[PDB]
């Protein structure tokens, strides 16, 4: 069962209040792991204030953001639902693997 | 409105609606309203 996060993932992206930022990151972190790790507490915040003030969730566009997000941002600085739905997501495309 | 009145307000009219959730989405409201307003205007995407 995944059609919960799938639902949520419809509803980010189907929505035009998308954030500008999350293009703009997605552009200068280039896929590179430690130029994400170096962000990590601006993307951090910026998740979790989004999805607090507007339900849809950031940084869904893009593979190379997802993954890292799913691997290096799961060491900590964000609550545990978010974190589970980035897995969800990386492990859904695993199934379809 | 929404809170005291148990009634959402400036759904009569179609400019409203479609400016709400263009313009006013930035922040300044709790999400449920916004999504009201969005899921109008998705229906009428739905049903063109």
């Given at each position: ?71 290096h941002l799961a060491d ?6 978010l974190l589970f739905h ?12």
């Open positions: 069962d995944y059609e919960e996060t799938l639902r949520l993932f419809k509803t980010t992206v189907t929505s035009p209040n998308y954030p500008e930022l999350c293009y703009l990151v997605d552009v200068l972190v280039h896929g590179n792991v430690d130029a994400f790790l170096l962000i990590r507490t601006f993307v951090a915040r910026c998740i979790v204030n989004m999805f607090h003030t507007r339900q849809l969730l950031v940084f869904a566009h893009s593979y190379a953001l997802v993954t890292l997000i799913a691997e900590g600085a964000l609550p545990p639902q980035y897995r969800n997501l990386v492990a859904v495309l695993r199934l379809v693997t």
